[model samples]
Target: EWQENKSWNAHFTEHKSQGVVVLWNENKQQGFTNNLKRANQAFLPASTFKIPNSLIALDLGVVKDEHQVFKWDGQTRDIATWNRDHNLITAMKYSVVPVYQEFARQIGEARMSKMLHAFDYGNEDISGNVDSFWLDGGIRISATEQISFLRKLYHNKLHVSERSQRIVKQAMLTEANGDYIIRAKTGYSTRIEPKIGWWVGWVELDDNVWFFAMNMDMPTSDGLGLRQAITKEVLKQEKIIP
Candidate 1:
């Protein structure tokens, strides 16, 4: 029910080939998107999977609580921040892959498969590797799926317990300025052909919350926050953010 809009796309110069989807929670049944075809195409979710993985870990008791610490291995990584110890909340904020990878390994394959099935997540495939399934190329989800999953999280409708959802939401909080509290996760897959990048989350307003997903061809890491930047621009255009 959405179509491509060039004017809207013009606001984002960072994406050479990309798509975006926006759903107005309060208004339901109505929204807008551009590059509708690509918007529906499934790609590797990268770190955004952390959102659901966080829920699954808590629900399964793999993570006793958000404060459970992950001690660093004393090895250097490209992202220096990831080389230190972290908890669920800080790891998510830093997008610390190693910490979450450890969580995936501890949760094991069979149970994660079960969790994905329970959630009916994107193709529900985690076959490539334990930690690499969502990080690498095995699992996939479209922008629509991103919106759907976010909606469930926002409404506390997922099978996961309410407390777990609340904590994950807290970990996802990015900005808390004035009337809006922005909750989101960014994903980047540099191994892909065009180096796909994603920004999926919701913006809270006085009476409504708008869910959004954006993915695009990011040929280089130089375009660090392109996903977030574009989503914010469009959200502002929709008057969902000021």
Candidate 2:
């Protein structure tokens, strides 16, 4: 756990002046802090929330397989607009918003809310009224809460059914190195006031799982361009991918 804290602190220190903080299981049940309070902060999840949408689609059986393809609409849409055609895996890989919005419509607000509640995601009031059009309004989650959610996912405890969990997990497995699997997804918002950046993924190292989700608030000018630099640096340090 100290190693984990070290990694967190390294990044935290680098961005300390930028209001960054590192929180993790250092020594106690909830003895974690950085810049913000431990329990009352939330940020809009631009694209990182796509992981949950994909999991929901799998659970609902909207698509036959991870490879099932949808044709692209062949027209450029604004950032708030969704993509037309994409497979489950590719939608996630490409971070297609339109495809996910359609999937959410098919699942409907009732079912999606139920699943999110089952996962114990968000605060009680927040989870109670999960809007069907949340993609437009943007979804929000706390950093520590995200960690908890990922732990449950790693343990196969978040899905409504085991079959659903297995399918989602299989779809997420990507090769980052020799037999070392990295499961990840990234997200961005094209039209929000200040652009939100995301790189959330897990690496299976030996028998242990290391899950990370990074979100950055930067000027809209750089957009997704900055994510390439940040993620590349992180992966290079870990030697997971070239």
Candidate 3:
């Protein structure tokens, strides 16, 4: 089912220098990837960290459910959404850093370390400090590894039970349409130098689900949207979505 194509290769060339990595998982539970070396290089998961963090919070009864509200600390920030009260799903939807930061503090570093180990996450390091760790600390994961983990998730075959995975799956849903569903998260390393941008998740079709993870340089603030824009183009070229 795989073959060479001009549009894909052409697109790849257009952004080749940005360190893009595209990872796909089919129903056969196999992974397909491009630019293996740079793709394999570990970088901060950024907001993508929320996916697992949400799962762990639910598993541990940290916040009860996605409806559990986290009150704002009354601080004005770049993202207006974070200044208001938000629940789990809302926080996730907006990538509200402060809400998840509170969760990480509550979850504590030791327990977080244990959770990271059990998940077999990339590098499995949560050292240095809380709140800022995933953004610029000990944790890191490659694009290939992102797909590997997502494959397990798509199949309902993760270390957790079907119920846990199912609940998180529900929360992951961002958009839905006729015979199509998209579950994804976008991440960015804003404060870090040589900035990184990520758009990671999958497109579900009638026959299969195509999962992907991609990150690129954010040389300027304008570079942030490239992650989603490029991803949408790739999905369109593959006919994975309308």
Candidate 4:
């Protein structure tokens, strides 16, 4: 069951935005959400799809390993950090769109669509440009679905091989301090009306893992950081983080 957590209100109101934060406790098999409706409403996955995309690439041998270097094509990308070469680590760290886009092209539409369905990712639609679908295309996933998908990945229960999942889990790492670790991804879609921003990932605290997915309205890029800020606010209240 899911419980509404009003403690998440001030953080969202502080930014003049609204969204939902869905958190799941693996150990207790419980879930919590601030907005039950949006938690089940599917939306574009944005870069969050990279978690599964990376797994598919590695499983299919489109990429050899995390250390495999993806050559820079020398084109000027809007994201300065992506204009240079990147291995899977840095590409994921920067949320490099072009890098994963290239992976999409290499994986092709048929394979991408098939794998998405097999992975039970979002709606598994992937109906637009193969390279840009998750960015702003037909693929959509609810916050609840995200937690289920992540739960599988956390236990290496997804369709992908455990090795590939391990590699991706490493790439998703955002923070690690002592006994606390955060492995997550953030996604933003400027191409859609009432743009949306996302922060999805799981936290490792001692022997438990708390998975979360947060998506908020982004009137402009100004509230981008709030995606994580709001999520952390809840995590702290739950005492999952410092």
Candidate 5:
């Protein structure tokens, strides 16, 4: 069952943005959502594609493990945090663009295309330049599609090697509270007509994993933070997190 929760629109209205959210309860095999239409609407993956990119990189031995250093060139970037070198964990934590760009370059188009199809990611379209397709290429994924992918990964059912999946899972760890753990990635595509913001991941409680994907019209930077804020608020209402 997929029940619509109308209250979520208030959260979107507060931020002056419109969006969709999908929350899947793994054990129950049911889900809840706001804007079921948008939940099925496909959009660019943006940096959220890094989750699978990391899996491919690790599977191909592009980097040894989460510890393998991705040395920084002397070039400074707008994002100050990315100025320094990073390993898989740090790169993922910071959502560093270049580090993942490097991973894509190493992965190359043919391999990347194959892997995307193998993972059944989004529309499996890796067209355009190799490094930025997820950001701007024709690739697209719906919020519900994101839930399906994450649900499979959570159960170690993706086509990737178990080690690769485990490593990416570790890299996704964003917050750990005494009662629950949150693993997530945020994606922002500023280059698009209407900037899109995304927060996708899962909550690990003692007995259940609740997966979520939220995307919104991020017209300005201010709307970025609402992605997680709204998701967490819903999670709190459901008593999924303390």
Candidate 6:
């Protein structure tokens, strides 16, 4: 039940850059591969890595819950607009870097490293410290690894307890359509000129589920916006859950 789709590739070409898209079906425990080569190549995760960080924080009881308030002090840096009052959910929705950075600090380097190591992320030399470095510099993941991690997230096997997993998923749930739910996180990094863009989320269709992660490096901060457009087009083309 695999269909070759090229519109996404066409978009990448139009933008003069590389793109990776991974799709997984949860109910059937089946996955469809796309853009594997590009995804396998190294690229930074930017803010997308925050999802795992959020999970770790939840697991550690550092935050009361997804809705727990974490005030932002309205610190401005780069192109991001910092806020002083934000909950975990709003921080994710608005993609407030300071909030996430605060959470990361609370999680600390040691615990963050521990979680990254337990997840078996990155290469052999990619230990907690190294992984932390990558995160500081933007974590790198191949398309295959992105999909693998997403699968683990779907199965509640991502080096976290079931409770933590559930909490994360619940927090990420967004209303994309009346019937279909979209649970995702987007990330970007400014160090690389144009910046990196990501849209990682899952779509639930009836008892079946589809997980997808889309990433692109662009010369502008609009990568996330473009990525979302791609997602909408994919859903529309497939006539799947909106």
Q: Give the per-residue lDDT of model 2 (tens digit) for 26-85.
A: 124332333344223566665667667777887778866787887776767864334466
Clashing pairs in 6: 39-142, 39-143, 40-143, 72-83, 72-84, 194-219
lDDT by residue (tens digit), candidate 4, 206-242: 8899999999998788878899999998899888988
lDDT digits (tens) for residues 5-49 of candidate 1: 666776665455455655545456455686667778898999999
What's model 3's overall lDDT? 0.76
Model 1 lDDT at residue 240 = 80
Question: How many angstroms is residue 83 displaced in model 3 relative to the true structure, after the best TM-score fit?
Answer: 0.6
Backbone clashes for every candidate come to: 0, 5, 0, 0, 0, 6
- Backbone clash total, candidate 1: 0
lDDT scores for all predictions? 0.82, 0.58, 0.76, 0.89, 0.90, 0.68
* Model 3 weakest 10-residue run by lDDT: 1-10
User: Model 4: which ten-residue window has the lowest total lDDT?
Assistant: 1-10
How does residue 30 of candidate 6 score in lDDT?
Answer: 56
Prediction 5 TM-score vs. true: 0.97
Which residues of candidate 2, in runs, are more than 4 Å off?
A: 1-40, 78-84, 124-134, 190-194, 221-225, 228-242
For all predictions, the C-alpha RMSD in Å is: 1.7, 4.8, 2.5, 1.0, 1.0, 3.2
Cα RMSD, model 5 = 1.0
Give candidate 3 regions above 4 Å deviation: 1-9, 12-17
Candidate with better TM-score, 3 vs 6: 3
Candidate 4: deviation at residue 34, Å? 0.7
Q: Which consecutive 10 residues in model 1 have the weakest lDDT in total?
A: 17-26
TM-score of 1: 0.94
